[PDB]
Amino acid sequence: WCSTCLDLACGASRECYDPCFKAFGRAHGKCMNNKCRCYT
């Protein structure tokens, strides 16, 4: 289904930038399905 997808809902680039950065390493993702999905 989703490879680089976190379990946190989107709503603030900063909110997902914390995890999306500590999980994948790069704060670069978007909000898909009420959830932030980072990509590489």
Q: How far apart are CA 1 and CA 12, in angstroms?
A: 23
The pair of structure tokens assigned to 37 is 């999905």
Three-state SS for the chain is CCCCECCCCCCCHHHHHHHHHHHCCCCCEEEECCEEEECC
Left if phi > 0, otherwise alpha if psi is -120 to 50, otherwise beta: which for 17? alpha
Name the CATH superfamily housing domain 1-40.
Knottin, scorpion toxin-like (3.30.30.10)
CA 24 vs. chain centroid, Å, equals: 9
Would you list the domain boundaries of the chain?
1-40
Q: What experiment produced this structure? A: NMR
Q: How far apart are CA 35 and CA 25, in angstroms?
A: 18
Residue 24 corresponds to which amino acid?
Answer: F
